[PDB]
Amino acid sequence: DVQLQESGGGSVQAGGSLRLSCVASGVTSTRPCIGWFRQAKEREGVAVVNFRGDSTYITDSVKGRFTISRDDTVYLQMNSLKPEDTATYYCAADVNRGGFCYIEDWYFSYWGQGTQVTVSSAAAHHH
Numbered sequence: 001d002v003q004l005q006e007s008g009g010g011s012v013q014a015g016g017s018l019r020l021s022c023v024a025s026g027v028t029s030t031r032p033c034i035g036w037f038r039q040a041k042e043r044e045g046v047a048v049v050n051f052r053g054d055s056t057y058i059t060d061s062v063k064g065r066f067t068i069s070r071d072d073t074v075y076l077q078m079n080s081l082k083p084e085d086t087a088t089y090y091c092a093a094d095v096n097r098g099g100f101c102y103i104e105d106w107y108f109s110y111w112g113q114g115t116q117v118t119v120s121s122a123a124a125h126h127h
Contacts, residue, residue, distance in 0.1 A: 002026045002093045002110040009115035013125045017079045022091035024072035032093035033101035034074040040087040049074055051099030081119045088114040
């Protein structure tokens with residue numbers, strides 16, 4: 001199996017930033033498309049990146065604040081965070097599309113355990 005190791009979650013204030021990472025191991029043939037998904041509600045897409053670094057985002061609003069990049073190690077840089085960005089973030093892999101990507105979860109067969117991201121309003125935030 002492809003194995004996915006997530007890191008970089010935490011608790012921040014609204015307007016803050018976090019950088020998630022996902023490291024894929026167990027890749028023996030096709031390098032995977034790596035995607036980030038989140039679930040606060042149903043699971044939803046965020047962004048995906050193909051084996052050569054080309055990215056696709058769920059919406060323009062998301063693309064304006066988050067950036068996905070690839071070194072099989074992928075980063076999701078999250079800026080200008082909204083309270084509503086609070087969720088468990090999951091990385092996922094698709095090795096059945098030649099290394100290329102779709103944004104939808106039904107193309108992904110390997111899932112990380114999830115990493116919690118908590119974004120608090122100014123009134124609620126404590127270090």
